[PDB]
Enzyme design. Structure first.
Site: not given
Ligand SMILES: *[C@@H]1O[C@H](CO)[C@@H](O)[C@H](O)[C@H]1NC(C)=O
Ligand SMILES: *[C@@H]1O[C@H](CO)[C@@H](O)[C@H](O)[C@H]1NC(C)=O
Lengths: 99, 593
Positions: B356, B486
């Site tokens: 991140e 997804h």
């Protein structure tokens, strides 16, 4: 939303010039007629300052000191330190420019 | 003149967009770190205002004609602004498509399969069924869970997908695309100077070319996994056949990472877990992010901002507010970069912190670019530049350098082999699934697959590409792809494939830049400023330039290459070849038990 800046102007500013005009910037060929929209933008945009902005975007207050000399006698002069007074001895005295 | 009008329009647009986008991002952050009704509604109005302003500016931007714009940065900005997306349809069709998307989202989040003959034991996917897919070894329970979720999702989502395909096709043809697959492939389209030109139709053939030479490594991995599962399941798996769909460690077979206890090379040798070392030395999340910052400044990238430390959450707050457990890196705009992660003192959270912060560094580098160009080069670059940091952070050299691992630690070949096998199960195993799923979606949107022969095509390709057979025959009333998160929520899936290729390409380029003389999987980019500058040249670009130029800037090539991927897994590939001499490498298309 109380800090503003000019984003659009027809020509560059001359040195030490201000522009407080609120005329709609005419970027195209059609007249703006005072109403914003496409190819007609308000030149003054707000600096929406928030405390969580990055260091490049936090508000900075700027004061520019410009010094000028003219034919008039210069009357803004810095302080000349006045030391303590010593008497009864041979001391080089400078009293109000008299040496 | 048209170019000057576009320049003034973009100058007017960027400041307003940056302000409204910052308000939207701040409202979304305030909802994500403090879940309540008022934050949700505030986020709703902020996103509504930002989206309405963006579409209003996009309609004006479509009036400009690109034939008389010479400078490629203004042309690229206008190309980015002119993407209408779902707004090209009428209000009725857009509302129907949004209704279909919302009902798909709320029926996937509330998916329910319940125990036959035991009506009180009804299980949702998120708390209990994922545990069954990850840990359980019983064949019948996994067969039950897979078939039950397939039935109670596919039967309810088949007509929804039937009109979803038609509405997306109408939207794409309303946006000058051949199909919705071409609309997704338009994210990789680059228009630029000679030799850097990339086309949407090129991408498919490039993916097939890169899948032409991953196939032996995948075949060897599949053979090894099949043999180990045959050891686990004595008579239910055939030596020459495909793997059952419910024995792959996940619900859909997307990741093989849950097969590592069953498929361990050397059970006696432990993993490279350093969680207990963090416990003994009293590490916390602040020290984790400080070590990540030390890594990013050792490689040459700039330090973290004061706002990053001040505004982010790095711990569970425990003061009454609900948060989202998923780590997310936020680029709010105006130099505001935050990370939302509930960091526990573990090795996985340490690697996630590096990932991140890699996302945040990527966001920070292109801050000098205009607002429309403050994105990744494509959808794969952004996650790849975090995955490279996750790769480098996990090396034994990096752990020994920062004191987590003892100086006298011995790195034998066995720990490298099992670590590489675990990485292959996570990384290599998702590539045939990703390629087959994206190919199926592209051919469905194109119309190459007939409408009444959807399922029969899909189970053929899983027999052919993935090498995984269905446990039970499925007719065309099922919708077996739609069980994935997804595809039921309208997300592109080729980004993972491109991420996987770009990750190892970037890693080999940085290791050659840093002059590392060993195996690629042991490589660390720490204490190498030249590799950091080589990386930061690409990171500073953003999407101002074509992605081929950025790829040449890092690796010296203008296309996807899987030679770094094979170079990373070369000791493991040799090991898999050494232990597949007697066995049969490959699978047979017909259903073998
Ligand atoms: C979360 O939002 C509520 C609603 O305004 C607020 O009272 C509370 O202080 C917030 N939490 C924190 C930690 O600020
Ligand atoms: C990189 O530099 C830091 C700075 O102190 C040092 O602690 C570390 O050992 C160095 N790493 C290597 C591999 O030399």
């Amino acid at each position: 939303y109380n800090y503003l800046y000019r984003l659009f102007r027809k020509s560059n500013l001359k040195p030490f010039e201000r522009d407080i005009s609120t005329e709609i910037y005419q970027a195209g060929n059609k007249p703006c007629n005072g109403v914003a929209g496409f190819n007609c933008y308000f030149p003054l945009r707000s600096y929406g300052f928030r405390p969580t902005y990055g260091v490049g975007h936090q508000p900075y207050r700027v004061v520019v000191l410009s010094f000028e000399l003219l034919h008039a006698p210069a009357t803004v002069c810095g302080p000349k330190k006045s030391t303590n007074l010593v008497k009864n001895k041979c001391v080089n005295f400078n009293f109000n420019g008299l040496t | 003149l048209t170019e000057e009008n576009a320049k003034t329009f973009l100058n007017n647009f960027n400041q307003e967009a940056e302000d409204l986008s910052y308000q939207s991002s701040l409202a979304s952050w305030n909802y994500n770190t403090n879940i309540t009704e008022e934050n949700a509604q505030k986020m709703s109005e902020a996103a509504a205002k930002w989206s309405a302003f963006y579409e209003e500016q996009s309609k004006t931007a479509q009036s400009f004609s690109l034939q008389e714009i010479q400078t490629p940065i203004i042309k690229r900005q206008l190309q980015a602004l002119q993407q209408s997306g779902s707004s090209a349809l009428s209000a009725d069709k857009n509302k129907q498509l949004n209704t279909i998307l919302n009902t798909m989202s709320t029926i996937y989040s509330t998916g329910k399969v319940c125990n036959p003959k035991n009506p009180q034991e009804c299980l949702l996917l998120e708390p209990g069924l994922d545990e069954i897919m990850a840990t359980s070894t019983d064949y019948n329970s996994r067969l039950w869970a897979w078939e039950g979720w397939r039935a109670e999702v596919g039967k309810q989502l088949r007509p929804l997908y039937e009109e979803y395909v038609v509405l997306k096709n109408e939207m794409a043809r309303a946006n000058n695309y051949n199909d919705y697959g071409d609309y997704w492939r338009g994210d990789y389209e680059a228009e630029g100077a000679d030799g850097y030109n990339y086309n949407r139709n090129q991408l498919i053939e490039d993916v097939e070319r890169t899948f032409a030479e991953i196939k032996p490594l995948y075949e060897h991995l599949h053979a090894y996994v099949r043999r180990k599962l045959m050891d686990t399941y004595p008579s239910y798996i055939s030596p020459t056949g495909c793997l059952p769909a419910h024995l792959l460690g996940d619900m859909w077979g997307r990741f093989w990472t849950n097969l590592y206890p069953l498929t361990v090379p050397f059970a006696q040798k432990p993993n490279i877990d350093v969680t207990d070392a963090m416990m003994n030395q009293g590490w916390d999340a602040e020290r984790i992010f400080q070590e990540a910052e030390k890594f990013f400044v050792s490689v040459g990238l700039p330090h973290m901002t004061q706002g990053f430390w001040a505004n982010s959450m790095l711990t569970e707050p425990a003061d009454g507010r609900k948060v989202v457990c998923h780590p997310t890196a936020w680029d709010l705009g105006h130099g505001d970069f935050r990370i939302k992660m509930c960091t526990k003192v573990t090795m996985d959270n340490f690697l996630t912190a590096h990932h991140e912060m890699g996302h945040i560094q990527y966001d920070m580098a292109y801050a000098r670019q205009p607002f429309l160009l403050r994105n990744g080069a494509n959808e794969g670059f952004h996650e790849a530049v975090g995955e490279i940091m996750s790769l480098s952070a996990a090396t034994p050299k990096h752990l020994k350098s920062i004191g987590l691992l003892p100086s006298d630690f011995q790195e034998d070949s066995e720990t490298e082999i099992n670590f590489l096998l675990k990485q292959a199960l996570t990384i290599v195993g998702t590539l045939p699934f990703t390629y087959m799923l994206e190919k199926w979606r592209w051919m469905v949107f194109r119309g190459e697959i007939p409408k009444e022969q959807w399922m029969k095509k899909w189970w053929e390709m899983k027999r052919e590409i993935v090498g995984v057979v269905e446990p039970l025959p499925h007719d065309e009333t099922y919708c077996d792809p739609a069980s994935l998160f997804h595809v039921s929520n309208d997300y592109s899936f080729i980004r993972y494939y491109t991420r996987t290729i770009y990750q190892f390409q970037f890693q080999e380029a940085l290791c050659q830049a840093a002059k590392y003389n060993g195996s690629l999987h042991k490589c660390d980019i720490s204490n190498s400023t030249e590799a950091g500058q080589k990386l930061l040249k690409m990171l500073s670009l953003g999407n101002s330039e074509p992605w081929t130029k950025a790829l040449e800037n890092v690796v010296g090539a203008r296309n996807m290459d899987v030679k770094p991927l094979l170079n990373y897994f070369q000791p493991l590939f040799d090991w898999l070849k050494e232990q597949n001499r007697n066995s049969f490498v490959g699978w047979n298309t017909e259903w073998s038990p």
